[PDB]
Structures are given as C-alpha cells and as structure tokens.
Amino acid sequence: EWPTHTVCKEENLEIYYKSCDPQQDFAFSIDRCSDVTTHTFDIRAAMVLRQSIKELYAKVDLIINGKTVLSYSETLCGPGLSKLIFCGKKKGEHLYYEGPITLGIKEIPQRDYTITARLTNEDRATVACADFTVKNYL
C-alpha cells in the first residue's frame, strides 16, 4: 500500500523499493546506479524513527523466484557494538544517512531479484523495512 518508488531506471538496470513497515514510508536514493554492481555504492536515506534504537539490527534477505536464497544479519548499534555515529538517536528523531552501503553478498546477482532489508531494535520491533526490486542486465 505504500507507493513503489523508482530508484534506478537506465538501459540495463532498474531498482525500485516499497516500504513494508505499515507505519511509514521513507526516502532513499542511490548517487550512481551502476555502482550497485560492485556491491558498494553511495546512498542518501531519510526516515522518522518511530522506535527506540538502543540496539539496532539489520537483516538482509536475497530472494530469487519467491525463494530466500541467502540471509544475513548485522548489528549496527548496541553496547560495545556501535558502527554508526547516529546510534543513540532518540525515538521521534528524523534520521539522515548519506554514505556508503556494502551488502555482504558474495556473487552480486545478475537477473531479477529482490533484497528485503529489515531493521529491528532491542525489542525485535521493526524500525524500517523495505523490499528492493532489482532488474540487473548490465
């Protein structure tokens, strides 16, 4: 029900996202779309934080033909485990990230696939959730 946003659409590469958090949408852009093929690329992203992030966890799933073929989890914030300066932001803050994203997928996939990313907190509550649809024929 959130709108599907176009992130990239060029000759041989298309990327769209839709928030799967029922509370809200968020803003997301990639500075250079073709960098996604290198698995490190720069983004800009913005969202209102609706949950505490005392702990922040990411879970990233690669889905190909309806099947989750790979899933990994990374700790972003926590006691002795904080990776981002914005760890520690309070519930209700407007969060802005500009910078690199590195996905821990080895053979960065060709073809059509989905990356689902969910951020959760100390209470397993969803802080953000998106489905990224990718069409990569580069």
Domain that holds residue 134: 1-138
Q: What is the DSSP string of 73-98?
A: EEEEESTT---STTTTPPTTPEEEEE
Contact 78, 88 (CB under 8 A): no
Q: How many domains does the chain have?
A: 1
- The resolution in Å comes to 2.0
Nearest partner of 38 among 46, 30, 47, judged by Cα? 30
What stretches of 3-113 show up as alpha helix (H) in DSSP? none
Which residue, chain included where needed, has tokens 């969910």? 118
In this structure, what DSSP letter does residue 12 have?
T
CATH for 72 = 2.60.40.770
> What is the token pair recorded at 85?
């300066």
C-alpha Rg value of the chain to the nearest Å? 15
How far CA 84 is from CA of 2, 46, 73, 96, in Å, comes to 27, 15, 16, 12
Per the listing, tokens 């899933």 go with: 71
Question: How wide is the angle at C-alpha 96 spanned by C-alphas 79 and 136, nearest 5°?
Answer: 100
Strand order in the sheet with 111-121: 5-10, 13-19, 126-136, 111-121, 56-64, 67-77
| Structure determination method | X-ray
